[PDB]
Amino acid sequence: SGAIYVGNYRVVNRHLATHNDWANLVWEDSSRDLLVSSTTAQGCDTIARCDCQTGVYYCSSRRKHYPVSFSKPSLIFVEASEYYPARYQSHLMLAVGHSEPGDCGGILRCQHGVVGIVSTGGNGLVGFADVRDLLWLDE
Ligand SMILES: CN(C)C(=O)c1ccc(F)cc1Br
Ligand SMILES: [Zn+2]
């Protein structure tokens, strides 16, 4: 699990979104595994605005941050899961690293701030849902 909190926005894996998230829906994209909901408290996180392909992500199944190289956000075929059928996930970034289902919502960070959140894994790869394109998260 895990979320990004920026201004009055909460960014979560669409597949981990609660009833409060859906009751306070701002925007959801099933093909990206993202849902944003509205919050009352002000969030302290900064979204990266950049095209970094290096950063650090939190891996809850190792209680460890790992530095990774990651591919630019693209449309990648992702196999069926405990939460989805096999489909093209959009705006997805892969790196070589450890990811289990419960690692979803781990944050990937570069020097500019938050890049995205763990969304996919398996076969020694970790997939991160990019958020850097969502400029509206910052006003
Ligand atoms: C077989 N497979 C794809 C996994 O166990 C997996 C790994 C990480 C993740 F975030 C989601 C899943 Br589903
Ligand atoms: Zn960056």
Swiss-Prot record:
Catalytic reaction(s) noted: Selective cleavage of Tyr-|-Gly bond in the picornavirus polyprotein
Active site per database record: H15 (for protease 2a activity), D33 (for protease 2a activity), C104 (for protease 2a activity)
Chain positions recorded as Zn(2+) 1 binding sites: C50, C52, C110, H112
Source organism, top-level taxon: Viruses
Quaternary context: Homodimer.
Functional note: Cysteine protease that cleaves viral polyprotein and specific host proteins. It is responsible for the autocatalytic cleavage between the P1 and P2 regions, which is the first cleavage occurring in the polyprotein. Also cleaves the host translation initiation factor EIF4G1, in order to shut down the capped cellular mRNA translation. Inhibits the host nucleus-cytoplasm protein and RNA trafficking by cleaving host members of the nuclear pores. Counteracts stress granule formation probably by antagonizing its assembly or promoting its dissassembly.
Record protein name field: Protease 2A
Upper classification of the organism: Viruses, Riboviria, Orthornavirae, Pisuviricota, Pisoniviricetes
Residues shown, of full length: 869 to 1007 of 2193
